[PDB]
C-alpha cells in the first residue's frame, strides 16, 4: 500500500483513492432526491429521527443559497454547510460586481472549481459531501445541477444522492416530468421516498420538501404544511 | 528500479525515470473515451464521442468540446474535474494576451503557456500533475489550420492527425496509413476520414446522437459546433 | 498555498548526492547531440526523430537562439529545457538594460549554472534533467561551454552528450584538430551523429545551428540537405 | 525640439533635429533623437531627455524578448500597448512625448503618445517645442499617397520650419525611411547651419602657463 | 509532509552529528590543494583533476579565485557549491570597503563567511555546504597569513596545510621538512613540488596537471601572480635533477 | 512511527500534554498551605555538590508585592512564565491603578500554557503554586502543564507528591494558624527528602494580609528547625 | 540653489591620442572656504578617470557606490572596463534615484584600452549621457567655460598644446566665478604615461 | 520558512535532543575555573596543538567586556557565535543603564538565548557549555556555568568537558579555605587538577588570571613550567 494516504499521489494504475474514499462517505447519509417539473424544481429529503430528544426542524439538510437558488445536501454535515457558506458568498459578489442575479451554469461552475481545488494537495482533504442545486428563472426556465466530491457537475431532469441511489432513480424515470406542473410532482416526490428505507433499518423518519418556480414567483422556499400533509395523506396508498 | 519515495512524489528513480507522471498518462484512459482530430488543406476537424447512460441526465451538458476564444476551440480527454479546470486557465491566458499585446493569440503560443503551467506540477514535489490531456485547433494567418496536443508532462507538438484516449494507438496506426498515400483533402473528406477513423476502431456504426463535431475553416474562422441535423447529412453520405 | 521548505537532496553516507547522480542518468537517456568549435565559429548539431509520420517537424525546435550571437541546444528531457531557456532569455536582458552591451558568453553560463545550483539545494524540488551546450562569438574568439544538472560548467573544444556519448567522444578525439573551417566542422559533426542514428538521415532528422562573426543563426532544411548530401 | 512623422504610399518617414538645451544654453549639438525599437519600428522622443531614453530601452528590450519567443516579426500595436499602459501607471510623472512608427504585416502605422498615456493613430504627427511650426507645413502641403521623394522633401521642410522659428531647436536634420523591405536610417540628411570660420590667431605656445607641481607616472 | 522530512539538523544519540561528517567525508576525495609560507610571499599549489585532452584552459585559473585586491582563495569539494560561496565573500570584502574605506583584514573575512556556513548546520532544515577552502592574503596588522575553513564552520591559522586526497600523507611530510621563518619563496616553491610529487599517484609530474599561484608584496601592489606553464616544468626538472644526485650519492 | 505534536490518543486525551505531566514527577517537592492567617509556602533545594553555592538556586520567586510563587519540574522554562506574570500585573496596575487579584493572574498564565503548534512548539514542563493575599483574603492556586488551575487548600507538588498529599490530609483543618502551618509543613518535608533537614536544604516564604511578601533567610529560619 | 551650495567645476577635453581632465580645489559652504585640497577627480582603473561636481555629499557618496559596483565587475569578469561601458553603469546608478536624485553631474574621460582612442561624455543628475568629440563641462561656472572652449579648441592637438589650452580655459573661466577657485589640478593621460600638474592660480 | 518541532517530549518525560547535546559537551577539552577573594583563576587544559602551526587563532578564553572573561567547552563552531551575540547585548546594556554589565546579568542573557532556542521551530539546541568569570562592581569575585538547556548556576569551583567528573570529584576533596590564601597558591590548585586530568604536561595547559582591576593576562609557557616545577617538587618532598 502507501499509494492511498495523500491526495497528491496517483496509484500505479492511475487513480486517486482519497477522492474515492471520500465518495464512500456519501453512501452513509440517507437520501436526497430532486426532480424538476415543467416549470420549476422540487427537492425532497427524507430525514432520520435518530432519537426522540431532537426537535422537529433541527439540523436541516436542505439549505437556501440565494433568493432563487436552492441546495439539498447529502454527506458529512459539517462540510455541507461549509460549502453552503462559500456558495452563498459567491452569489453576493456576482450581484455586487455585475448587478444582476447569478445564473446557474456559472454558479455551479464557480463552486465546483472550489471543490476541485482540494483534490490536488497534501495539505487539505477532499470534501465528504455531494449536493444538488436547483432554481427557476423567467428568462431561463428551471435548472438542476449536481456536484460530486470530485468536482464534476452535470445537468439532470432528476437526480438522487444518498444510500439507495440506484434504488431511488429507478422509479424517477417511471415519471413524466417533461409535462407535469409542480403540484402533482409534490405528491410523486414523497411517494418514491416512501417505498425506500424499509422499517427494519429505521424506526421512524421525517419528510422534508422544498419548492421553487414561478408558482413560488421565482423565490425559493419550503412547501406549506397543508400541501405536504396531502403527500402524507398520499403515503399509505403504496401498500396495494 | 525504485529507491526512496520515488514511487510517491515527483523525484528521480535510479534508472532516470520518474513514475508519478507516467502513472498519470494512464489516468486519461479511465474516462473510457477517445477523440480524433484531423487537419485538412483549408480546415481542421475535431470529432469525439459522448456516452450518455441515463435518460434522467440532460444531454446538452456533457459536451467535451469547449470554446476557448472566438477562433480557438478545444476538446478534453481524461478525467472531467481536471479537464474543466484547465479550460478555465486557457480562457484566462488568452484574454491577457489580448490585453497586454493588442491582438489575437496564436494557437501555438497558447499551447506553450499551458504546457509551462503543467510543467510546474511535475517540478515541485507537492502538487498532483493534472491527469488530463488537451487538443487545440485554430486558423493562423500565413500558416493555414494547425492542431496542437498538450499532455500532462508539459510536452507539446504540432500534428497533422491526432488521436487521444483509450484507443489511441489503434487510431494512429489507422491514420498514418491514411495520410501517407497523400490524398488531397477537401472539407467533406476530412470529416469523412475522421468519422471513419473511430467508426472502424471502435466498430460501432453509430447514429448522430453519440458524437459531436467541432470545426474551423478558412472561410468562416469561428469555432462552431455542428448540429445533429447536419451531422446526419455527413453520416448518410458516408454510407454510399 | 505554500511550499515544503526542506531539501530533499541529502548526502549519502558514502558522500554522494544521489539525486544528482540519478538526474545524470536521465541526461544519458536523451537524444544524442554533438558540438564542435573550429577557429572561426561553433557548430551545434542535434538529432531529432519524430515517433511517426503524423508529427509536424517544423513546429518545435531544439536549437534555440538566446540573443543575436548565442545559441543553445540540450540533451535531456523536453519540458525542463523550455524553462531555463525562458530564464536565460531574460538574464540576457537584465545584463543589456544595465550595460548597453550584448552579454558575453562566459557571463551567461555564470548565471544559467547559478540557477541550477540554487535549484538543486532549495526546498521541495527535484533538480533539472538536462545538460546544455552554449556557443557564441564574443570579441572574435568563439566559445563552447557545457553545463550539467549539478551546476558545474566546462570549456570544451568538442564534445557529445546523450546516448553513446562515450563513443562520440572517442570518435571526436581521432578526428578533431585545431585547424578547421566552419564548413569543415559541419561535415565532421554530421559524420559523428551518423554513428548512432537510424537508417535514413534526411533533412528533417537533424537540426544544425552555427555561429560566425556575423552572429548566431540556424540552418534552414534546404542547405541541411546539401550538407547531408556528399556525406559519409 | 522638433520631431515629426508622415505616412506615404509605402511606408513611414520620421524626422528630428539635433539640439539639447539645458536652461537656455546649448548643451549638445548632435543629440540623436531617433531611437531603435525593433528592426521595423523606430520611435522619436521629446520632453525630458532622460525619461525618453530609459523608456525607449525598456520597451525595446521587451519586444526583443517577445519576438524571440514567438519567432516572428513584432507588430506596431504591441509597442503602442506596452507604452500607454506603463505611462498611465506612473500618472504622468514620467514626461515622455513619443512618435511611434513602423511597418508590420498589416502595413504602416503611425502613433503619437502623450506623457499621461493618451494615444492616437494619425497619418501625420508633430511633437516637441517647435511642433506648431512643423504642423503648419504639414497642414498646408499634405496629400495622401505621396511617393517617398515627396515625403522626404516634405518632412525635411517641416523640420526646417522648427529650426528657423523656434529658439529651442536647430541643427542638422535627421531622417529615417521605413518601408516594407528597406530601412534607411541616416543622420546628416542636410546641414542648414554651419559655424563661421575663425579670423584671429589665438594660438599660445608651450611655457605660457605657470606650474606649481608636476608628477609623472609611467604605464605599460 | 513530516514523513518525507530527512532531519538534516538534529544530533545523533552518540553526541555527534552525521550530516557534516558525511560532507567532511566527501571533502576527503576530489581535489588537492596546499599552501605554505615562511617569509615574504605565500603560495597555493593546486592539482588539476580533469586532464582530458579537449578543453580550452581559460578563466585565468581553475581552483584559484581572486577575492579582494590583495587576497585569494583555493577551493576543494563540490564545485557548484564553491561558486556560490566565492561570490558571497567577494562582496563581503566590498561592503567592508564601502563602510570603512579601507581594505579588509584577512582574518575577519574568514570569520564572516564561516558564520554563514555555520548557520546551515544549525537551523533551516537544509543541506550544508560540502566545501573546504584555503585563504592566503596580506594585511597591515600581521602581514602574510594562511587560513583553512571547514564545512562545520570552524577555521584556523596555519603555516602549511593540505586538504588533498592524501592530505594526511602530505601533512606528515610537511612537518618533516620545514623551518619557521626561514623558508623563502624559492625553497617553498622547491618544497611544494616535492610534496605533490608524493601525494599525486600519477607520476612524473606533468606540468599541466598542477596550478601554482603566489602572493608577493610590492609596495602598493600585493602582486597575486598565477605563474604560467613555461616556468613550471623547469621547476619540475629542478626537483628531478637533485633527486638523482641525492639518491646515487647515498 | 512519528506522530505530530498535536495528536489525540485513541483513549482520547493527547500525547505530549500527558507526557509533560510525567515530567513534573522529577522535580523537587514543594508544599503550600492556605491558612486564614496567611499563606505559607515551602520547597526543598536538592543540593547536589558540596562545591555548589546554595543560594544561587531558588524555587520561591515573587510576582508582585503580594503574590509569591513556587515551581517544580523543569526550571529553565519556568522563568518564561514568571516573566509573563510579572508584566501582566504591571499592565493591570498601569491601566486600572489597582492590584490584580491572585486568581486573575493565574488564568493569564494558563491561557499561555497551551499555545504550541506549527504556525505563527511544545508544552511547558513545569508546575506552579500561587500564594497571594487579594481582597478576598489569602488564596492558593495550582496550575498544570495542561492549563488547568484550581484553588487548593494544601497542595503538595513534586516527586514526593502523593506521599505528602496523604500525610497532609490528616493534619490540615480549616482553623489552623500560620505559626503552626509552617511547623506542620517542615515535618512533611523532613520525611520525604533525602538529606537531613537544615537551614540550607530548604527555604520558606509567607504572605500575610498586613505585611507584603516576605521570604525567610538563614537567621530566622532555623528557630523553627530547632523547635520542630 | 542646491548646486551652488558648494560650487565646483569639471572640464574634459579631447586631444589627438590623449585626453585631459581638470577640476578646481575649493571646498566651501556658500561664502566660506574650508579647505583647498578637496578631491573631485577619481581614478577608475588605468587610463580612465571620472570627475564629479555638485553637492559635496553626493560627490563623496556616488564615488563610493560606483567603486563598489566596479570592483565586483572587474572580478566577475576577467578584464578592465571599457570607457563606453562605465557610462551605462553610472546612468543606471543615477536613474534608480529617479525621485530621490543625487545632486551631482559626472564627467567621464579615458582611453579605450585595446585601441587607444579617447572618449569623453557627461551626464545630468538623472543620467542622460551625451558623448561629444571636443569638450564637456560641468559645474556652476558652465557658461564661462563654453566661451573658452568654443574659441580655443583645435581638432588635432599634441599633449603639449592640449595642456596649454585646457589650462587657459580653466584659469580664466574659474577666475570669473565667485564660488569656484583656490587652485586647479590637471590630469592629462595617454597610452604610455600619465601626468598630474597643479597650476598657479589666484587664491583670491 | 522551515517550521518544525525538533525537540519533543519522551514517553517517560525527557527531551532527547537536550540530553544528546550534553554528550557533545562531554567530549570537548577540559576547562577548569576557580575563584578567590581578590583574583580569579581559570584555564583550559588539552591545548593539543600541532606545535608547528599558529596558536593565536585557537584561543578559547575570550573577553565579553573589560570585567567579564569567558571559557567554554563543546564544539567551537556553535560557541563563538554565542560570544558575538553576547558582546552586542553587553554593549547595548551600556547605551541603556549606565554601569558596566554585572556578571549575573550577562549569564541570564546567555541562558535565555539558549532556553528559547530549544523551544523554537526547526532549530537544534546548542552544543556548548560555558564558564562566565568576572568581578563586578564593589569587587565581588564570582563565576557561573551554563548547561545546554539554559540553567545558569553559580559555583565556587567548576570543571567541564571530557574528564570533568573525575576532576570535579578531585576538586571537592582539595578546595579548602587556605587554598585561596595567596594568588599563586590558587594557581597551583588549578595546575594540580589539570595534571590530574587528560595529560597536561605543561605544554597543553594554558592558564589565565584576573586581579579584579586588569584585563585577562595569559602567562607564557615559562611560569607554567615554573609552577609545574614547584608543584611537583612540593609533591616530591612530601611523598
CSV table of C-alpha atoms in Angstrom, one decimal, chain A residues 6-192:
chain,number,residue,atom,x,y,z
A,6,UNK,CA,-2.2,11.6,0.3
A,7,UNK,CA,-4.4,13.2,-2.4
A,8,UNK,CA,-1.2,14.2,-4.3
A,9,UNK,CA,-0.2,10.6,-5.3
A,10,UNK,CA,-1.6,8.6,-8.2
A,11,UNK,CA,-2.0,4.9,-7.9
A,12,UNK,CA,0.2,2.6,-10.0
A,13,UNK,CA,-2.8,2.2,-12.3
A,14,UNK,CA,-3.7,5.9,-12.2
A,15,UNK,CA,-6.5,6.9,-9.9
A,16,UNK,CA,-6.7,8.8,-6.6
A,17,UNK,CA,-8.1,6.8,-3.7
A,18,UNK,CA,-8.5,9.7,-1.3
A,19,UNK,CA,-11.3,11.0,-3.6
A,20,UNK,CA,-12.8,7.6,-3.9
A,21,UNK,CA,-12.7,7.1,-0.1
A,22,UNK,CA,-14.4,10.4,0.3
A,23,UNK,CA,-17.1,9.4,-2.1
A,24,UNK,CA,-17.8,6.3,0.1
A,25,UNK,CA,-18.8,8.6,3.0
A,26,UNK,CA,-21.8,9.9,0.9
A,27,UNK,CA,-23.5,6.5,0.9
A,28,UNK,CA,-23.9,6.6,4.7
A,29,UNK,CA,-26.1,9.7,4.5
A,30,UNK,CA,-29.6,8.8,3.9
A,31,UNK,CA,-31.3,10.0,0.7
A,32,UNK,CA,-31.8,13.4,-1.0
A,33,UNK,CA,-33.7,13.4,-4.3
A,34,UNK,CA,-34.7,16.3,-6.5
A,35,UNK,CA,-36.6,16.3,-9.8
A,36,UNK,CA,-37.5,19.3,-11.9
A,37,UNK,CA,-41.0,19.7,-13.3
A,38,UNK,CA,-42.2,21.6,-16.4
A,39,UNK,CA,-42.0,25.0,-14.7
A,40,UNK,CA,-40.0,24.5,-11.5
A,41,UNK,CA,-37.8,22.3,-9.3
A,42,UNK,CA,-39.0,20.3,-6.4
A,43,UNK,CA,-36.5,18.9,-3.8
A,44,UNK,CA,-37.1,16.2,-1.4
A,45,UNK,CA,-35.2,14.9,1.7
A,46,UNK,CA,-36.2,12.0,3.9
A,47,UNK,CA,-34.8,12.7,7.4
A,48,UNK,CA,-34.0,10.2,10.0
A,49,UNK,CA,-35.3,10.6,13.5
A,50,UNK,CA,-32.2,9.5,15.4
A,51,UNK,CA,-33.8,9.8,18.9
A,52,UNK,CA,-36.9,11.3,20.4
A,53,UNK,CA,-34.9,14.0,22.1
A,54,UNK,CA,-34.3,16.1,19.0
A,55,UNK,CA,-36.6,18.8,17.8
A,56,UNK,CA,-38.8,18.8,14.7
A,57,UNK,CA,-37.0,21.2,12.5
A,58,UNK,CA,-33.4,20.5,13.7
A,59,UNK,CA,-30.3,20.2,11.5
A,60,UNK,CA,-31.9,20.8,8.1
A,61,UNK,CA,-30.2,19.0,5.2
A,62,UNK,CA,-31.8,21.5,2.8
A,63,UNK,CA,-30.3,24.9,2.6
A,64,UNK,CA,-31.1,28.2,0.9
A,65,UNK,CA,-28.2,29.8,-1.1
A,66,UNK,CA,-29.6,32.8,-2.8
A,67,UNK,CA,-33.1,34.3,-3.3
A,68,UNK,CA,-33.8,31.9,-6.1
A,69,UNK,CA,-31.2,29.1,-5.8
A,70,UNK,CA,-31.7,26.1,-3.5
A,71,UNK,CA,-29.4,23.5,-2.1
A,72,UNK,CA,-30.0,19.9,-0.8
A,73,UNK,CA,-27.0,18.1,0.6
A,74,UNK,CA,-26.0,14.5,1.5
A,75,UNK,CA,-22.7,13.8,3.2
A,76,UNK,CA,-20.8,14.9,6.3
A,77,UNK,CA,-23.0,17.8,7.5
A,78,UNK,CA,-20.1,20.0,8.8
A,79,UNK,CA,-18.6,20.0,5.3
A,80,UNK,CA,-22.1,20.6,3.8
A,81,UNK,CA,-22.8,23.9,5.4
A,82,UNK,CA,-19.2,24.9,4.8
A,83,UNK,CA,-19.8,24.6,1.1
A,84,UNK,CA,-23.1,26.4,1.6
A,85,UNK,CA,-21.3,29.4,3.0
A,86,UNK,CA,-19.0,30.0,0.1
A,87,UNK,CA,-21.7,29.4,-2.4
A,88,UNK,CA,-23.9,31.9,-0.6
A,89,UNK,CA,-20.8,34.2,-0.6
A,90,UNK,CA,-20.1,33.7,-4.3
A,91,UNK,CA,-23.6,34.8,-5.3
A,92,UNK,CA,-23.2,38.0,-3.3
A,93,UNK,CA,-20.0,39.0,-5.2
A,94,UNK,CA,-21.8,38.4,-8.6
A,95,UNK,CA,-24.5,40.9,-7.8
A,96,UNK,CA,-22.2,43.4,-6.2
A,97,UNK,CA,-20.0,43.4,-9.3
A,98,UNK,CA,-22.3,42.6,-12.3
A,99,UNK,CA,-25.6,43.9,-11.0
A,100,UNK,CA,-28.0,41.0,-11.5
A,101,UNK,CA,-28.9,37.6,-10.2
A,102,UNK,CA,-26.3,34.9,-10.8
A,103,UNK,CA,-27.2,32.2,-13.4
A,104,UNK,CA,-26.8,28.5,-12.5
A,105,UNK,CA,-24.4,27.4,-15.2
A,106,UNK,CA,-22.0,29.9,-13.8
A,107,UNK,CA,-22.9,29.4,-10.1
A,108,UNK,CA,-22.3,25.6,-10.2
A,109,UNK,CA,-19.1,26.3,-12.2
A,110,UNK,CA,-17.6,28.5,-9.5
A,111,UNK,CA,-18.5,26.2,-6.6
A,112,UNK,CA,-17.2,23.0,-8.4
A,113,UNK,CA,-13.8,24.6,-9.0
A,114,UNK,CA,-13.6,25.4,-5.3
A,115,UNK,CA,-14.4,21.8,-4.6
A,116,UNK,CA,-11.9,20.6,-7.2
A,117,UNK,CA,-9.1,22.7,-5.6
A,118,UNK,CA,-9.0,20.4,-2.5
A,119,UNK,CA,-8.2,17.3,-4.6
A,120,UNK,CA,-4.7,18.5,-5.6
A,121,UNK,CA,-2.7,19.0,-2.4
A,122,UNK,CA,-1.4,17.0,0.5
A,123,UNK,CA,-2.2,19.9,2.9
A,124,UNK,CA,-6.0,19.5,2.6
A,125,UNK,CA,-8.5,16.7,2.3
A,126,UNK,CA,-11.4,16.4,-0.2
A,127,UNK,CA,-14.9,17.3,0.9
A,128,UNK,CA,-17.2,14.5,2.0
A,129,UNK,CA,-20.4,15.9,0.5
A,130,UNK,CA,-22.4,15.6,-2.6
A,131,UNK,CA,-25.2,18.1,-3.2
A,132,UNK,CA,-27.7,19.4,-5.7
A,133,UNK,CA,-28.6,22.9,-6.9
A,134,UNK,CA,-31.9,23.9,-8.4
A,135,UNK,CA,-33.6,27.2,-9.4
A,136,UNK,CA,-36.0,28.9,-11.7
A,137,UNK,CA,-35.8,32.0,-13.9
A,138,UNK,CA,-38.3,33.6,-16.2
A,139,UNK,CA,-35.6,34.1,-18.9
A,140,UNK,CA,-34.0,30.7,-18.4
A,141,UNK,CA,-36.6,28.2,-17.1
A,142,UNK,CA,-35.7,25.7,-14.4
A,143,UNK,CA,-32.2,24.3,-13.8
A,144,UNK,CA,-31.0,21.3,-11.9
A,145,UNK,CA,-27.3,20.6,-11.2
A,146,UNK,CA,-25.4,18.2,-9.0
A,147,UNK,CA,-21.9,18.1,-7.7
A,148,UNK,CA,-19.9,15.1,-6.5
A,149,UNK,CA,-16.9,15.3,-4.1
A,150,UNK,CA,-14.5,15.1,-7.1
A,151,UNK,CA,-15.8,18.3,-8.6
A,152,UNK,CA,-17.8,17.0,-11.6
A,153,UNK,CA,-21.1,18.7,-12.4
A,154,UNK,CA,-23.9,18.0,-14.9
A,155,UNK,CA,-27.5,18.8,-15.6
A,156,UNK,CA,-30.3,16.5,-14.8
A,157,UNK,CA,-34.0,16.1,-15.3
A,158,UNK,CA,-34.0,14.4,-11.9
A,159,UNK,CA,-31.2,13.0,-9.6
A,160,UNK,CA,-30.7,11.3,-6.3
A,161,UNK,CA,-27.9,11.1,-3.7
A,162,UNK,CA,-27.8,9.0,-0.5
A,163,UNK,CA,-27.7,5.4,0.5
A,164,UNK,CA,-30.2,4.0,-2.0
A,165,UNK,CA,-29.2,6.0,-5.1
A,166,UNK,CA,-30.0,3.4,-7.8
A,167,UNK,CA,-33.0,2.2,-5.9
A,168,UNK,CA,-34.4,5.7,-6.0
A,169,UNK,CA,-33.7,6.8,-9.5
A,170,UNK,CA,-35.2,3.5,-10.8
A,171,UNK,CA,-38.6,5.0,-10.2
A,172,UNK,CA,-37.8,8.6,-11.2
A,173,UNK,CA,-37.7,7.6,-14.9
A,174,UNK,CA,-41.2,6.0,-14.5
A,175,UNK,CA,-42.5,9.5,-14.1
A,176,UNK,CA,-43.1,12.0,-16.9
A,177,UNK,CA,-41.5,15.2,-15.6
A,178,UNK,CA,-41.5,17.0,-19.0
A,179,UNK,CA,-45.2,17.9,-18.8
A,180,UNK,CA,-46.2,17.9,-15.1
A,181,UNK,CA,-46.5,21.1,-13.3
A,182,UNK,CA,-45.0,21.4,-9.8
A,183,UNK,CA,-48.2,20.5,-8.0
A,184,UNK,CA,-48.7,16.9,-8.9
A,185,UNK,CA,-44.9,16.5,-8.6
A,186,UNK,CA,-45.1,17.1,-4.8
A,187,UNK,CA,-47.2,14.0,-4.3
A,188,UNK,CA,-44.9,12.0,-6.5
A,189,UNK,CA,-41.7,13.2,-4.9
A,190,UNK,CA,-43.0,12.0,-1.5
A,191,UNK,CA,-44.2,8.6,-2.8
A,192,UNK,CA,-40.9,7.4,-4.2
